[PDB]
Design a protein around this ligand. Sequence first.
Ligand SMILES: O=C(O)CNC(=O)C(=O)O
Ligand SMILES: [Mg+2]
Ligand code: NI
Ligand SMILES: [Zn+2]
Length: 331
Amino acid sequence: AQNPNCNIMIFHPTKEEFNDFDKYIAYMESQGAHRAGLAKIIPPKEWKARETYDNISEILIATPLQQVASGRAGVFTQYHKKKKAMTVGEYRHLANSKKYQTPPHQNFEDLERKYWKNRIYNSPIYGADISGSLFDENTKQWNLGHLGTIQDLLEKECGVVIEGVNTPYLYFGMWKTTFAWHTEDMDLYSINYLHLGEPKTWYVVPPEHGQRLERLARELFPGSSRGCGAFLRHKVALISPTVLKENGIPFNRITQEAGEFMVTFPYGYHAGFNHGFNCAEAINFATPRWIDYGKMASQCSCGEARVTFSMDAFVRILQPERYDLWKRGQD
Ligand SMILES: O=C(O)CNC(=O)C(=O)O
Ligand SMILES: [Mg+2]
Ligand code: NI
Ligand SMILES: [Zn+2]
């Protein structure tokens, strides 16, 4: 078995290897990459996502989210308070302000220490989940707006034609903006490209150990667990590396820099934080190997998780027994 310790693997495809996206994902899996839950892909030196980032300031962040924490430094939840609209240029100025800017630090490990010590005492503002793309239309390789759709994959594997669409999302971050512990909708893959700015640190639990993280989370968030049998679908709970180590949960960490892709694999729990002003693009995708994960994915039916239009068909076809309860949660 390849990669039996479930380490995060880093790949350096050549320009020739960068042509066929599906084939390269399958290659990475042949080397055991998926066992970690997360992989990094450094694009060939010849590749670029677009020519420059000099003209993005007028993108609108219609609903910036202030991420307010509750709990203790290593075990906390966050809620999202909606703020007034602002442009990307206005958000960048805010990120760079004395109130929100990255503090002085020695290296990524020192900044990580400071994050976990101090995150809860601040409320950073995240421009998350903005439909759109920064890839040039002429970028033919690893263009996250031109990937094969999940609906087409389901139809190719299973024969059933379904409604729905699959488009990318932009994320504008600042110091301490936080992504809570989660797997993707329907335990899909994700791919994330860091277009510009400061890094993003990731934590990940191997898919084969995801239930260990779930059991810890039920212990640490006992009211939330009574409320919902899949409350990590709410995407609000944080647990630090120190607390994971104290509880014997297997995990890994890695820092993504501008110009790099990360892939999350089915049922790979992940969480993380941004180092400073940045912009990322991400989308969900599927492969043949996903189908079995999609059939077994947990679901939130309490009403909190509320998701896209296109998840309806995935539940309806892959999980017909669960469909009626889940749809009630949507309505
Ligand atoms: O970058 C972020 O805030 C969160 N991204 C992801 O969870 C992802 O790409 O799967
Ligand atoms: Mg613009
Ligand atoms: Ni994710
Ligand atoms: Zn729920």
